[PDB]
Amino acid sequence: TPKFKRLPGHIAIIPDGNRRWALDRGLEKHEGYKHGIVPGLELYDICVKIGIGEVTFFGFTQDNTKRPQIQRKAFVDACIKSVKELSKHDAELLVVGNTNSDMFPKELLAYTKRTKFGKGKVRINFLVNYGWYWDLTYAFDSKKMIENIASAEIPRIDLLIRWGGRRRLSGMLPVQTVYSDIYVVDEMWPDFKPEHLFNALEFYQDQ
Amino acid sequence: PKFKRLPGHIAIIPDGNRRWALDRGLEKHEGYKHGIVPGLELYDICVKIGIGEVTFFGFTQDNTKRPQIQRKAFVDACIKSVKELSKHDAELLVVGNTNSDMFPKELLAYTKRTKFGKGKVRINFLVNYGWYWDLTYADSKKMIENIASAEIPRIDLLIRWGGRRRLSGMLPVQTVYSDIYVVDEMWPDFKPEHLFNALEFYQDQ
Ligand SMILES: CC(C)=CCC/C(C)=C/CC/C(C)=C/COP(=O)(O)OP(=O)(O)O
Ligand SMILES: CC(C)=CCC/C(C)=C/CC/C(C)=C/COP(=O)(O)OP(=O)(O)O
Ligand code: DMA
Ligand code: DMA
Ligand SMILES: [Mg+2]
Ligand SMILES: [Mg+2]
Structure with a gap:
C-alpha cells in the first residue's frame, strides 16, 4: 500500500470481461464468472487494508438476464457465491436490485437490508438484477424523488474502476456516477491484480 | 479519413479553457473566446464526415458561481457559438434552466429545436444545465420521457477535452451506455485528429 494523500470515500467496480477471459483460456463463455469471485475478495481485502470505506460492485443488470440460460445461471451463481464469501469477512453488505422479478436470486433477498458481518470494516454494495x-423510476415531492431512487442507500461514487477495457458506465448508478473519476483497466476482471487498484488510486489522488 | 462505423450522436465536453489560458500566460477568463473556433471546426468536420447529432456541454448551474469575469466570458462564448452555428445549416436546440437569471436571454430563441439553412446536423447546447x-423536471414511464433534456437522445460517444475522465453530470440518462474518449489537451488546442482518434476508438468498440 503506497502513502496516499487522499483516498476515494466510495469506489465503484465494473468487473467486466469474464466471457472474453474464458474464451481466451479455451473455456465456455459461462465458465469465466467463477474466476471473478477471488478477484472480488482480493479487491475487498486490499480496500480494508488501505482504508477504503465503501465499494459498490456491479453484479448484473436486468439486460444481462436476457443472455442464454447457461450464462445467467453461471453469473447468478458467482454473484451469490461472492456475497456468501464476503459475509465471512468484516463487510457491511447491501444488495440493490429489482426484487419484484423472477430474475432476482432469492438467496440474495436476505441482503437487501444492509447487514454487518464480523467487524463491518467496509460497506460493500452489490447491484443484482439492477x-x-x-x-x-422507483422514485415515483419531486425534490425528494432523487432521495427515493431504488439505490438511494448507495452514496455518490468518487472513483469508478472498470476492467475489460470498455470506457462506459453500462447504466451503473447514473445519479451516483455524475462526477465520478473513471479509470479503465484493459485486462479482463479475472486477470485482476493489486496494481490495477493502486494505479486507479494514484490517478484519483493526482486529480 | 474513412470510418467503418460512425456514432449517431456525439457529446462534447469542452473543458480546460482556464488551464489553457493560464499556460499561455493569459488571464483565466481569456480561454473561452479561443474555444469558439474549435466548436465551429468540430461542427464542420461532423457535417463533412456525416455525424447526425452533436451535444456540447456549454455550462452548468454550478459554473455560474465562478467570478463574474469568467462567467461573462464563457456565457459570451456560448452565445457566439450558437449564433455562428445558426448561420451554417445547424438544427439548434439549447437545453438549460430558463427559470433562472443565469440563463442567457439571447438563447431563449433556441429552447425549441430550430432548423437553420439545410439543417445538415442537430446541434444541442447545455446552458445553465x-x-x-x-x-427532477419530471406515469413514471412518462416521467423519464419528460426530463428537461428529453429532446436530446441517447449519446453513442462522449469526447472530453482537458484530460479529466468524468461526466461532470452531463445528461445522466443519455450517457448510461456512451463510450467515453478523453483527449488530454485542453479544448482550445482542439485538432481534427482528436475527433478522428475518438471515432477510431468508437468503431473499434
Ligand atoms: C465481484 C463479482 C461480481 C464476482 C462475480 C463475477 C460476476 C458474476 C460478474 C458480473 C456479471 C457480468 C455481466 C460480468 C461482465 O462480464 P461479461 O459477461 O459481460 O463478459 P464480456 O464483457 O467479456 O462479454
Ligand atoms: C460549447 C462551446 C464550444 C462554447 C465555447 C467555449 C465555452 C463557453 C466553454 C464552456 C464553459 C466551461 C465551464 C468550460 C470548461 O473549461 P473550464 O473553465 O472548466 O477550464 P479548466 O478546466 O481549465 O478550469
Ligand atoms: C454488470 C456488468 C459487469 C456489466 C458490464 O458489462 P455488460 O457486458 O453488461 O455491458 P456493456 O455491454 O455495456 O459492455
Ligand atoms: C460545462 C463543461 C465544459 C464542463 C466542464 O466541467 P467543470 O470544469 O465545470 O467540471 P469538473 O470540475 O467536474 O471538471
Ligand atoms: Mg461485458
Ligand atoms: Mg473545468
Missing part, C-alpha cells in the same frame, strides 16, 4: 431505468 | 434540475 437497471438504471428501474432505479430512477 | 444541472443533472438534478434535468431529472
Whole structure:
C-alpha cells in the first residue's frame, strides 16, 4: 500500500470481461464468472487494508438476464457465491436490485437490508438484477424523488474502476456516477491484480 | 479519413479553457473566446464526415458561481457559438434552466429545436444545465420521457477535452451506455485528429 494523500470515500467496480477471459483460456463463455469471485475478495481485502470505506460492485443488470440460460445461471451463481464469501469477512453488505422479478436470486433477498458481518470494516454494495431505468423510476415531492431512487442507500461514487477495457458506465448508478473519476483497466476482471487498484488510486489522488 | 462505423450522436465536453489560458500566460477568463473556433471546426468536420447529432456541454448551474469575469466570458462564448452555428445549416436546440437569471436571454430563441439553412446536423447546447434540475423536471414511464433534456437522445460517444475522465453530470440518462474518449489537451488546442482518434476508438468498440 503506497502513502496516499487522499483516498476515494466510495469506489465503484465494473468487473467486466469474464466471457472474453474464458474464451481466451479455451473455456465456455459461462465458465469465466467463477474466476471473478477471488478477484472480488482480493479487491475487498486490499480496500480494508488501505482504508477504503465503501465499494459498490456491479453484479448484473436486468439486460444481462436476457443472455442464454447457461450464462445467467453461471453469473447468478458467482454473484451469490461472492456475497456468501464476503459475509465471512468484516463487510457491511447491501444488495440493490429489482426484487419484484423472477430474475432476482432469492438467496440474495436476505441482503437487501444492509447487514454487518464480523467487524463491518467496509460497506460493500452489490447491484443484482439492477437497471438504471428501474432505479430512477422507483422514485415515483419531486425534490425528494432523487432521495427515493431504488439505490438511494448507495452514496455518490468518487472513483469508478472498470476492467475489460470498455470506457462506459453500462447504466451503473447514473445519479451516483455524475462526477465520478473513471479509470479503465484493459485486462479482463479475472486477470485482476493489486496494481490495477493502486494505479486507479494514484490517478484519483493526482486529480 | 474513412470510418467503418460512425456514432449517431456525439457529446462534447469542452473543458480546460482556464488551464489553457493560464499556460499561455493569459488571464483565466481569456480561454473561452479561443474555444469558439474549435466548436465551429468540430461542427464542420461532423457535417463533412456525416455525424447526425452533436451535444456540447456549454455550462452548468454550478459554473455560474465562478467570478463574474469568467462567467461573462464563457456565457459570451456560448452565445457566439450558437449564433455562428445558426448561420451554417445547424438544427439548434439549447437545453438549460430558463427559470433562472443565469440563463442567457439571447438563447431563449433556441429552447425549441430550430432548423437553420439545410439543417445538415442537430446541434444541442447545455446552458445553465444541472443533472438534478434535468431529472427532477419530471406515469413514471412518462416521467423519464419528460426530463428537461428529453429532446436530446441517447449519446453513442462522449469526447472530453482537458484530460479529466468524468461526466461532470452531463445528461445522466443519455450517457448510461456512451463510450467515453478523453483527449488530454485542453479544448482550445482542439485538432481534427482528436475527433478522428475518438471515432477510431468508437468503431473499434
Ligand atoms: C465481484 C463479482 C461480481 C464476482 C462475480 C463475477 C460476476 C458474476 C460478474 C458480473 C456479471 C457480468 C455481466 C460480468 C461482465 O462480464 P461479461 O459477461 O459481460 O463478459 P464480456 O464483457 O467479456 O462479454
Ligand atoms: C460549447 C462551446 C464550444 C462554447 C465555447 C467555449 C465555452 C463557453 C466553454 C464552456 C464553459 C466551461 C465551464 C468550460 C470548461 O473549461 P473550464 O473553465 O472548466 O477550464 P479548466 O478546466 O481549465 O478550469
Ligand atoms: C454488470 C456488468 C459487469 C456489466 C458490464 O458489462 P455488460 O457486458 O453488461 O455491458 P456493456 O455491454 O455495456 O459492455
Ligand atoms: C460545462 C463543461 C465544459 C464542463 C466542464 O466541467 P467543470 O470544469 O465545470 O467540471 P469538473 O470540475 O467536474 O471538471
Ligand atoms: Mg461485458
Ligand atoms: Mg473545468
